[PDB]
């Protein structure tokens, strides 16, 4: 069939039966407030395939998924809209999945899906494939993402890059999003993914046959899709063309430019000779005084009107390209008899869309007698009063405030065209809030001289002589740290502001001294003159210097951090560190110095066989005030010295320091050292200017190398000779190279078991090269020896055999 105007299903699931036959609807489809929610799955409707207006579902408590109701809904043309939207599913308390798996093309509107408690599978389907301008969609308030978890069967399903993601795309747990490959391009495609005729839209029952098209992307007539409907066929409701047999019999019509409409448009009027003649004004009527405009649904009510005898208030919060559509509906207005106002229209970038507005007669005015009013347009960059087009206000005041991105001169430029200066005070057209972020007209100041040092900058600029020297009041200098040249005046006001006054002497050009700047750093600087913007409005010329880049000279740095060292192998020592705390310039390298520190001559003076002392034993939490004070104090402490190390300390540039320099890495290894001998490691830290200014001071450490195991052991065999009084002398060689030192020797001996033990001092060996064991008992004996070095006891010597004669 072809359903009559609209179909509103409500009260109970029974009445839904009205859709039982219908295949295309020339109107909206409302399914609302089926509170009983009982019958549920008792109804099906495969006939519906095309809806020529929006589709709305509201609080149908008993339904699970639209796939049960409308399996074959293929195109929602959206020739009208429901508040910018062609499909709305709101407060569906029990809806789990959308469905509509055959839906393939939405023509005009966006989609709103909101407050659906348990609707998953949202954003899991690539909407850019079904409609353009995905930015105008609005999905919020639904079931939180992490709770359910979208899936397709086997998740084994069709894929693409969903936004920046890459995943399956799921209408519902049982059905993937039926999509055919890109090979068809702009064309439609049938089951098995074969491309059909370029006039089929959505599905298509046969490949490349005009009649098989389910719907027509341009027009439908006599069961055949056609890019333009045949001659003598009048476009009706924007999807089918008819003849006078039809338009003449719809309940109250006219014809014009092939369109069948309810009335003739502007510039054409009824001619009584025949009803068809829309022979070459149009007035909207008012019921409210204030005809607020917020959406294309409300703006479309004005389509075709020449004279609007009401009040306009514009509050367009959002919309990427709504301005394009408002032109077609409102662009034909030429007279607004009442006041005009704007409010939070954060979407408007230009009032150009109001193409043919001329007059604002001000028959009614806001409180305070304003006839044109603009306030808090956070993005209104442009008014429409270019000199090419006229705007005449016949009475009333103006007012402007909080227009951050509207340049104030533009308001004054418009102020001139209407010729309405003699009605406003400062507050109405103040410069202190209206337009303080948009540039344009400006003299140019010329920096005459620049002077720089390591911590200060001095600049001067030419004498700005405005057309009236009294206009200038002062000069303001802006500057901030700017390592890179991608900087603009409007980067946040980070910009430091300084005030400077023109010196009373008129022979000296002004200038400034800036102090407290970081050395070796890039600073941006520009100049804006301050003038009294009044009496001659835009003729107060204003001045702005160009952005100038300055870098102040340089000085010196700091040292190596986390200097650490250890020993992994004999004659080798591993050293690590980090970059210094404040390079104050490009680091280049490190310097490593090392030195032997003597084996303790302080220590081979001690007789360790003699007395030795007894061993004594064996979501960031807050911060309390007092704390703050404490970690302040330590700060002042550590700052009190640094200004000492400075005074630009300037390192121009028993055993001497061996030296080397680091190439690329904050770690180094020094090898081929004397084993177990103590050393010093000293490291400087250098910058690219340390080659001339000198390299930072040192953080140093000591190291004792790994000993050569057994090197402290006796390097030869033990020798024994008899001595009087049944005494025995044992002569052995001293270890040529000790592990730091030879401290002691220990001898264990005995007659049958080596019970005897004694301590032999180093000095005793020095005097005699050995020791005399005296007053031994008669009998045979055996004996071993353990020199003790600084790295621990050596290994015991080979057995020494000697005897004492009883006779």
């Amino acid at each position: 069939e072809i359903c009559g105007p609209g179909i509103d299903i409500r009260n109970d699931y029974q009445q839904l039966k009205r859709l039982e036959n219908c295949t295309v609807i020339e109107g909206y489809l409302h399914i609302l407030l089926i509170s009983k929610a009982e019958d549920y799955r008792s109804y099906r409707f495969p006939k519906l395939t095309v809806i020529t207006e929006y589709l709305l579902l509201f609080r149908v408590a008993g339904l699970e998924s639209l796939g049960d109701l409308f399996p074959n809904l293929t195109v929602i043309r959206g020739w009208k809209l429901f508040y910018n939207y062609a499909l709305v599913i709101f407060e569906m308390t029990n809806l789990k999945d959308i469905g509509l798996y055959n839906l393939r093309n939405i023509t005009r509107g966006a989609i709103r899906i909101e407050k659906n408690a348990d609707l998953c599978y949202l954003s899991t389907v690539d909407w850019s494939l079904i409609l353009d301008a995905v930015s105008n969609n609005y999905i919020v308030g639904n079931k939180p993402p992490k709770e359910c978890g979208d899936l397709c069967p086997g998740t084994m399903c069709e894929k693409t890059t969903i936004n920046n993601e890459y995943n399956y795309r799921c209408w519902t747990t049982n059905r993937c999003q039926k999509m055919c490959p890109s090979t068809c391009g702009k064309r439609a495609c049938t089951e098995n993914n074969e491309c059909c005729h370029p006039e089929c839209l959505g599905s298509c029952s046969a490949p490349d046959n005009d009649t098989a098209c389910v719907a027509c992307r341009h027009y439908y007539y006599a069961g055949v899709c056609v890019p333009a409907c045949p001659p003598n066929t009048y476009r009706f409701e924007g999807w089918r063309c008819v003849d006078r047999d039809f338009c003449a019999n719809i309940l109250s019509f006219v014809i014009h430019d092939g369109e069948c409409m309810q009335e003739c448009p502007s510039g054409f009027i009824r001619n009584g000779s025949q009803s068809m003649y829309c022979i070459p004004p149009k007035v909207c009527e008012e019921e409210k005084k204030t005809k607020t405009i917020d959406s294309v649904t409300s703006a479309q009510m004005l389509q075709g009107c020449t004279i609007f005898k009401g009040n306009l208030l514009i509050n367009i919060r959002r919309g990427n390209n709504i301005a394009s559509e408002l032109e077609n509906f409102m662009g034909l207005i030429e007279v607004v008899t009442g006041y005009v106002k704007i409010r939070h229209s954060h979407a408007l970038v230009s009032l150009s869309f109001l193409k043919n507005l001329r007059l604002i007669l001000g028959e009614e005015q806001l409180e305070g007698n304003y006839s044109f009013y603009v306030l808090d347009n956070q993005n209104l960059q442009q008014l429409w009063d270019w000199d090419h087009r006229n705007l005449t206000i016949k009475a009333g005041k103006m007012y402007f405030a909080f227009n951050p991105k509207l340049c104030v001169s533009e308001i004054y430029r418009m102020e001139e065209v209407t010729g309405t200066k003699g009605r406003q005070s400062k507050g109405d057209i103040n410069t202190r809030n209206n337009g303080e972020r948009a540039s344009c007209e400006s003299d140019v100041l010329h920096f005459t001289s620049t002077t720089t040092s390591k911590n200060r900058i001095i600049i001067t600029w030419h004498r700005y002589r405005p057309p009236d020297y009294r206009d200038l009041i002062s000069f303001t200098v802006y500057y901030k740290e700017a390592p890179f040249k991608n900087v603009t005046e409007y980067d946040g006001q980070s910009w430091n502001m300084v005030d400077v006054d023109l010196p009373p002497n008129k022979d000296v050009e002004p200038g400034i001294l800036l102090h407290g700047l970081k050395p070796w750093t890039q600073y941006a600087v520009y100049v804006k003159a301050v003038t009294l913007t009044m009496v001659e409005n835009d003729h107060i010329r204003g001045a702005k210097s160009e952005i100038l880049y300055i870098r102040t000279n340089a000085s010196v740095p700091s040292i190596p951090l986390d200097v650490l060292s250890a020993s992994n192998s004999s004659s080798q020592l591993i050293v690590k560190w980090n970059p210094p705390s404040l390079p104050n310039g490009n680091l280049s390298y490190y310097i490593v110095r090392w030195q032997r520190q003597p084996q303790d001559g302080y220590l081979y003076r001690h007789n360790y066989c003699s007395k030795d002392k007894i061993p004594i034993r064996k979501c960031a939490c807050p911060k309390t005030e007092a704390e703050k004070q404490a970690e302040k104090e330590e700060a002042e402490y550590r700052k009190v010295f640094e200004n000492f190390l400075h005074n630009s300390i300037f390192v121009p540039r028993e055993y001497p320091f061996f030296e080397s320099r680091v190439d690329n890495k904050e770690r180094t290894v020094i090898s081929n050292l004397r084993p177990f001998t103590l050393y010093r490691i000293d490291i400087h830290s250098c910058n690219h200017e340390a080659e001339k200014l000198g390299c930072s001071a040192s953080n140093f450490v000591f190291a004792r190398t790994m000993p050569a195991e057994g090197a402290d052991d006796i390097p030869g065999p033990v020798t024994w000779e008899p001595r009087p009084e049944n005494s025995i002398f044992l002569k052995w060689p001293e270890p040529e190279n000790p592990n730091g030192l030879i401290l002691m020797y220990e001898i264990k001996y005995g007659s049958q078991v080596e019970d005897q033990r004694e301590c032999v001092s180093r000095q005793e060996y020095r005097k005699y090269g050995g020791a005399k064991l005296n007053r031994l008992n008669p009998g045979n004996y055996t004996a071993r020896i353990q020199a003790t070095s600084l790295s621990g006891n050596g290994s015991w010597t080979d057995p020494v055999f000697f005897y004492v004669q009883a006779k």
Partner: peptide, 30 residues
């Protein structure tokens, strides 16, 4: 019903509890 100001979801719930069944309409026939 409540003697306070009705709005939004509360409005819808109160309206249902007042009317109930078979009483509440939007008429395409008009």
């Amino acid at each position: 019903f409540v003697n306070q100001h009705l709005c939004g979801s509360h409005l819808v719930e109160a309206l249902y509890l007042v009317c109930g069944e078979r009483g509440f309409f939007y008429t395409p026939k008009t």
